[PDB]
RNA sequence: CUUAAUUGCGAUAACGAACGAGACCUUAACCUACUAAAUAGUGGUGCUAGCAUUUGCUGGUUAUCCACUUCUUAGAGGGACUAUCGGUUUCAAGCCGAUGGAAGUUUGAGGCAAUAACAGGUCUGUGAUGCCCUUAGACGUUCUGGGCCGCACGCGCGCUACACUGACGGAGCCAGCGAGUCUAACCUUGGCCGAGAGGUCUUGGUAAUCUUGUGAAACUCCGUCGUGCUGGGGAUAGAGCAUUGUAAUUAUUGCUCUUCAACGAGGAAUUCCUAGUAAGCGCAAGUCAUCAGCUUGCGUUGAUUACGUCCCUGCCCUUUGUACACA
RNA sequence: GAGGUAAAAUUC
């Protein structure tokens, strides 16, 4: 299975819709379900954390835990 | 697990048969008295003799 | 909790909940019981622990193995297969994220799931190999309540390692997937399947 | 209220001291930066690729103040690591000597480090002025 | 950081120096598929042409691809201190030359040709396809392929 | 003079000398406070004589602990032994005995080797094996 | 399937070829006047509540 | 433990324990010439060194 | 001079071991039984402890 | 019957003894007590630097000036003896459980270790040696060169790996057992030069002093990497810079660039191990002018699973069978 | 006064 490391306009709209629907999001969640690369999935977490869509309850270098906005 | 040897039971038989006065069933008065009245080379075998005389002084007043 | 000023700065998150009742960093060691049989001195809870790291002497005595906390025993079983012998600070961190993933999905008090994972993944009857000669026949014998704790921790850390092998999902992610499926057994994990397979063979051998 | 560098944590101080000297500009690079491995036991150059000379210099300037005096050979044994030598297992290899000297030559013209007597290098009165002022700025930001 | 949103002008596998380049990966490994240069040489060229290492292959403007080739064809004039090249003190003219894609296959043959025509022991061992760096061939080397 | 007691806590090779002198209640480990323990996981192990005994209980004395020898886990279990042993020392010679047994029974049901040393020592290595009990391997033919 | 609990009141000893099966006389919790000897596998102390898959099964000696 | 190479690989260890003392004595030189000819003992080294400068 | 004590005390044992075999081979016909050495300044004493000292 | 034990309690044509076991010794653990320490440390007083300034906090400085021995060192000693208590066997030897205690598996681990025996190994440890051979164009000795490293193939002990519990880049920074130069060139601090390897100028230490706090690795943090024989793997091969040595070609070895293969958890079989042990990890020492990937010690991180049985391999004690005694 | 139990295994 190929993973897209470069975003598309039709793929960028899919990220803003399906991520706050999810209960648990992480690095392994975005690679397996949204079919993006592992190096690209780390950058997308900081893009959603800065805007305030996802909420970190625990931050670590190896494992990243993020929940939805309450 | 642990069984005493014969030389512990040999010296303990020699103590009880002649030192029934000046010794009671307490260990601490059976330990510091063997420092002078007997010539034991090491502390470890000395405590094993006094640990076995104390075991036998308990079962004299019983039977 | 009657706060007071002090020279070295200890934060508010430490002095508030850790001085009134003996809970975790900011988590729960609350009134969670067992939904199975009693299992006397097999569940550690009351008395609780601070973290999963402990240098106790629980392996010297045959009886005091059940006195070890099961949160520590999950760090102990994630500490094998070669390169991971030692490195317990890696193993406590995996359990630290394992309780975080459980705490999200329907808010799911995480100490309830770990205790229920032990009671719903233990094979209730085992088989032993004795007699026969040449072509030996297996005999189905009962199992101790100690080994039902011992096999539950083994079947939830080996299958969480093979599911996290050669894929994007990490160790603490697949381990939480094993424990949530262990609460409601639907043959969707490793230990729920291997519990049922060891009992459907034990039926033909008794 | 009184503050020192030991009251400040290990890596928040380094990430703030190296960020403060980035704005000052007084760096005095020799010129063989960005092409060096900075060790004889590593495998790749550092991944920062723009700067990263302040990052070791922030670690050295704190390493001197917490001790009596250190030299070049002390910064080579600590900052080194195990070398991936190949089919036979690892061995402790000291770090590069030329990197650890030019940091102590760049911090000397500023006034932070000084040539200590009886060997080694100690901290100066300007080093205790600068490294203790911004150490207060780390704790005041987080409260 | 930031995700690019301009258009579908992303350019994968495209070839330079007649050997193919692995597309849609980090730009520091675009050059590593070339036989003759390595990971250390690919990182040095991408730091001299003002190329961001936090990107993929990406856009690959034609003004940027020509500067990468210009460094690789003239390494001794573009701030390389000559201890980094692979072929130093050459047997042809004594200069410092850096091998290329289809060049390292030809120069390795020329390094084996000048040793077989002089009957030296460093070259005759390559004629039977054996080990030349002087180790025990008692147990190891039993595959031939 | 000022009231000053001193104790020690011992793991395998890590000793933690804890001078408990008078002051206004500061806890420093090698000049750095107790909030800066080198493992982030094992930081709550040295907090265990800071939670069970009471919130502060430090109205008159300071804590100053230094480390000699050990590792990264062996020194964490030495400084938390030095505080619990260095607390019952001050509550003996100055504070009355009746309030010290409240501290002793507190670290009795939760024993966890705080007011008692760990006598487990590494076994010496014998010949033939890379470890103490182990052996390399043997081949029959 | 039904579940049946049983409390350990007496233990006999090890019985088997390799020595891993213990003869344990368990007493049911739903019937305090009836007991059945069962063969178990792991470490069993007294007063332990076990889970029996088959209620009625008499244990024999393994050879 | 073996002189040849045959047998089980049994190793053999030895040890020699060296004990050392030093005593500072602010003494006149008259008792120095007496303390050297007295308290002699085989296997014991006696050293007299110059002062702090 | 100037020998470390981890080597001088070892060399004193070699000095005793070297004189063990020579006073065994030379004093074989005189009933040799072992020697002891006593080092003192200005006079080093080596005691020859044998059975028959008139032949020695 | 009871133990690790021919251990003992006892039973008895045997009674009293000699060996082994045990004892003893060494080491690791405990003592806020003893004798003491500028070659081991702390507290206080002076001088002095920085931060807050209301008294503080963190450091520096060697005969300023005194006190102390808690750690560390080790002389003499103390201390568990299965002690106390509750059960169990007919009492008795002993076992099991709890409490106390630094420690209750023989306290943990070693050293020593009988009788009888082997056609076990070493004549290549020996100026320990019988006999035989050789004794000068020498199977004495010495110098130059080569070999012991050659190789379609089989086996044994080990090392690195088949990664995302990981590689890679910064940063956190933690030990013990050790070893080191006299009529010389050992361990090396510090300052310069060099990408590295290293080079150079000096200094400390014949050693609890200096190297050395061997600020070692695994590890911990912060990032990159995202499953693709990839950035896992570093074999093979080219070119160059240096060190050791009279001499390195068959690359001694170190370093830098480049080459970047097999290997996707290993068939039949088989080895080691029960607690601070297994495993992971590095250091020191031995051999050493130079080189371990070996070995002898040591420390750091530290499990899972038994507390049993004689099923397999095999060992002790009796009873019995034998046509075996080269068993 | 009652209390488990059979594979194959040849020669020097
Ligand atoms: Mg298992
Ligand atoms: Mg497993
Ligand atoms: Mg993955
Ligand atoms: Mg340089
Ligand atoms: Mg191209
Ligand atoms: Mg890269
Ligand atoms: Mg050939
Ligand atoms: Mg070959
Ligand atoms: Mg080679
Ligand atoms: Mg305890
Ligand atoms: Mg060891
Ligand atoms: Mg072997
Ligand atoms: Mg002894
Ligand atoms: Mg003392
Ligand atoms: Mg024998
Ligand atoms: Mg031999
Ligand atoms: Mg030989
Ligand atoms: Mg010989
Ligand atoms: Mg002739
Ligand atoms: Mg002739
Ligand atoms: Mg002639
Ligand atoms: Mg010649
Ligand atoms: Mg040769
Ligand atoms: Mg990765
Ligand atoms: Mg790392
Ligand atoms: Mg650190
Ligand atoms: Mg000198
Ligand atoms: Mg020392
Ligand atoms: Mg350190
Ligand atoms: Mg760390
Ligand atoms: Mg085999
Ligand atoms: Mg080594
Ligand atoms: Mg060596
Ligand atoms: Mg056993």
Residue numbers in the entry:
A (entry chain Z2): 36 to 105
B (entry chain R2): 2 to 64
C (entry chain F2): 20 to 225
D (entry chain T2): 2 to 144
E (entry chain S2): 2 to 146
F (entry chain Q2): 3 to 143
G (entry chain c2): 5 to 67
H (entry chain U2): 69 to 121
Can you list sentences taken from the study reporting this PDB entry?
Crucial for the recognition step are the conserved protein factors Dom34 (Pelota in mammals) and the translational eukaryotic elongation factor 1A (eEF1A)-like GTPase Hbs1. Dom34, similar to eRF1, can be structurally divided into the amino-terminal domain (N), a middle domain (M) and the carboxy-terminal domain (C), which appear highly similar between both homologues. Hbs1 consists of a unique N-terminal domain of ∼160 amino acids, followed by Domain G and the β-barrel domains 2 and 3, which are highly similar to eRF3 and eEF1a. Similar to termination, where the stop codon is decoded by the eRF1·eRF3·GTP ternary complex, stalled ribosomes on non stop or no-go mRNAs are recognized by the Dom34·Hbs1·GTP ternary complex.
